[PDB]
Amino acid sequence: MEPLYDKNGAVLFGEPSDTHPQSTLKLPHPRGEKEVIVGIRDLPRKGDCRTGNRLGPVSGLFVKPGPVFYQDYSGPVYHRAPLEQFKQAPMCEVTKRIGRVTGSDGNLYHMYVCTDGCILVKTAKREGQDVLKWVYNVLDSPIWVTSCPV
Ligand SMILES: [Cl-]
Ligand SMILES: [O-]
């Protein structure tokens, strides 16, 4: 299975991998001051990275099925979408674009939230095009979707 990472970027099992250079996740980057859940209509907004906001600190954006969004998180996360837990699916109607995430296969994916609450990824590539939803979450851990810029 795809490895999890701790808040100092150390892998908790398996072997570590680098994120795609064009992902909205850029490492190394610190996180884990506080676990902070956010509503999707209340995602962290420009300048929140430096200062935090009324909800707490901001290390970027994390998400897991539910959907549950977080603006900071301290426990194990995915640095890449664990594609064994995703299933090929039709393009949904999307509520929001949330980032560009590295897949388990090393490829770049656009990540969206669908109106049905599903987290969906679609290959960034022009040729070869997969569309998937995050349907199992066996270790109950979010993907780190985007990191704050500094
Ligand atoms: Cl997995
Ligand atoms: O920001």
Residue numbers in the entry: 21 to 170
Sentences from the paper on this structure:
Npro is a key effector protein of pestiviruses such as bovine viral diarrhea virus and abolishes host cell antiviral defense mechanisms. The nonstructural protein Npro (N-terminal protease) is the very first protein to be synthesized, releasing itself from the nascent polypeptide chain via a single, autoproteolytic cleavage event (Wiskerchen et al., 1991). Detached Npro is proteolytically inactive but acts as a viral immediate effector to modulate the host cell’s antiviral defenses (Ruggli et al., 2003). The overall structure revealed two compacted folding units: a protease domain (orange) and an interaction domain (I-domain, green).
In order to compare this postcleavage, product-like Npro with a precleavage, substrate-like variant, we produced an S169P mutant Δ(2–21)Npro S169P6His, as proline in P1′ was shown to prevent autoproteolysis (Achmüller et al., 2007). To elucidate the detailed mechanism of the single autoproteolytic cleavage, we determined the structures of Δ(2–21)Npro and Δ(2–21)Npro S169P6His to 1.5 Å and 2.0 Å resolution, respectively. We provide mechanistic insight into the proteolytic assembly by describing a substrate-like, unprocessed P1′-site reaction intermediate. Here, a solvent molecule trapped at the active site offers a consistent reaction mechanism highlighting distinct roles of the catalytic water. First, the solvent molecule reveals an untypically short bond distance to the Gly67 amide of 2.3 Å, indicative of a short strong hydrogen bond (SSHB, aka low-barrier hydrogen bond) typically ranging from 2.3 Å to 2.5 Å. Third, the positively charged side chains of Arg70 and Lys66 contribute to stabilize the hydroxide within the anion binding site. Several indications point to the existence of a hydroxide ion at the anion binding site. The geometric proximity of the activated water molecule to the scissile peptide bond suggests its relevance in catalysis. The substrate strand β4 with its P6–P1 residues is rigidly anchored to the edge strand β2 and His49 by a hydrogen bond network both before and after cleavage.
